[PDB]
Amino acid sequence: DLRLHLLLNTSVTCNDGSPAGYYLKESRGSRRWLLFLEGGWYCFNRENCDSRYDTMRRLMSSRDWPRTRTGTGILSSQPEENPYWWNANMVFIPYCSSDVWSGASSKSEKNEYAFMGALIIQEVVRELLGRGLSGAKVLLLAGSSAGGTGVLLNVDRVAEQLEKLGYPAIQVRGLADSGWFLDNKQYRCAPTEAIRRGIRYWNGVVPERCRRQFQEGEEWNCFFGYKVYPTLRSPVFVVQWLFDEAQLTVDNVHLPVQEGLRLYIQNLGRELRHTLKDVPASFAPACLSHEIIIRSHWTDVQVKGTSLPRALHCWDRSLHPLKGCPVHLVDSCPWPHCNPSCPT
Numbered sequence: 001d002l003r004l005h006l007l008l009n010t011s012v013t014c015n016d017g018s019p020a021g022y023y024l025k026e027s028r029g030s031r032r033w034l035l036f037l038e039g040g041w042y043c044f045n046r047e048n049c050d051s052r053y054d055t056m057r058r059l060m061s062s063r064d065w066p067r068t069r070t071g072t073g074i075l076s077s078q079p080e081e082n083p084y085w086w087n088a089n090m091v092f093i094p095y096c097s098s099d100v101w102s103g104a105s106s107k108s109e110k111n112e113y114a115f116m117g118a119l120i121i122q123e124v125v126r127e128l129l130g131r132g133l134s135g136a137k138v139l140l141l142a143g144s145s146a147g148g149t150g151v152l153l154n155v156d157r158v159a160e161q162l163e164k165l166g167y168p169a170i171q172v173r174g175l176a177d178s179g180w181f182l183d184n185k186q187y188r189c190a191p192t193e194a195i196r197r198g199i200r201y202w203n204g205v206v207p208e209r210c211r212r213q214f215q216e217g218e219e220w221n222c223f224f225g226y227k228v229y230p231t232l233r234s235p236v237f238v239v240q241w242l243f244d245e246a247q248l249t250v251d252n253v254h255l256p257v258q259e260g261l262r263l264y265i266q267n268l269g270r271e272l273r274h275t276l277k278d279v280p281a282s283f284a285p286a287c288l289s290h291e292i293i294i295r296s297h298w299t300d301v302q303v304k305g306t307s308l309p310r311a312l313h314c315w316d317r318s319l320h321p322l323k324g325c326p327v328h329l330v331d332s333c334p335w336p337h338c339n340p341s342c343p344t
Ligand SMILES: O=C(/C=C/c1ccc(O)c(O)c1)O[C@@H](Cc1ccc(O)c(O)c1)C(=O)O
Pocket: 300, 301, 302, 304, 305, 306, 340, 341, 342
């Protein structure tokens, strides 16, 4: 089990002003640290956030959090469930800021809610340094869904923070699962505009080089993986289903497929594959599904005969091509479940 610690700096808060926090299981024989960012959509104005507070309150408040959680998938300490990093120090950071991990704005007489996701990550890192992170060799910042996009928005800031604090031996890397989306045309509500409005409501922040390319008022571009990834300096491994259910939902696709929809789905897969061509560390199976890394059976899927735990191990070796140890694994078959190992 991982144990809850509420942040000692109680001014770094969830949406409703309650303290943010993290769950930790230490492994004193290991110099590897895995920090995982939870996902769960976002909210972008007062009325939309009020609705989320009624029926998704654990994503906005720590008032009802449990004292422990079980680590699963890449967060499991059992070698059989986690061939990759079972002996690592494990951290789960709950998502309670509703801002895709981008916000830097406190609750005030002008703000009903606080949006502090970017500050929560930096405060977790600072407080872990006294619990053993100061001795680390690798810090892997991982996340799924909105947490996967959060990795892309925050990995370089973590690297910069540790350098400025005086810890140049810690190698910071990212793993972004199910957070690589396209700002495409819908098959038949305005998903890209919701991000633009959210950034203004949250005081959202994006990585510096990407901000400088797109300039004032265009920071929404940096929430899309294919636009922000080329600007990043830290190594980042990308995991993305070619036919992600969240992408299909925002595209208004709900699955006897006729020709128009067949062509739409085939084109989506081809576009996603194109965006990954210059991503050297990636795992992209031709399946209709969502999320991958914290489920217990994450070991089952394979691309070209290689599982995700193997690909991540090969990535570790490459950061010290390798014979029989590939790191770029993107399916080329053009329809969901053309890969026989897709989740059932
Ligand atoms: O038919 C299958 C089914 C594979 C499969 C089906 C479900 C799984 O969960 C899984 O891990 C693998 O095998 C593949 C070939 C194959 C499978 C595993 C390998 O390690 C390999 O190198 C090739 C085929 O299409 O011929």
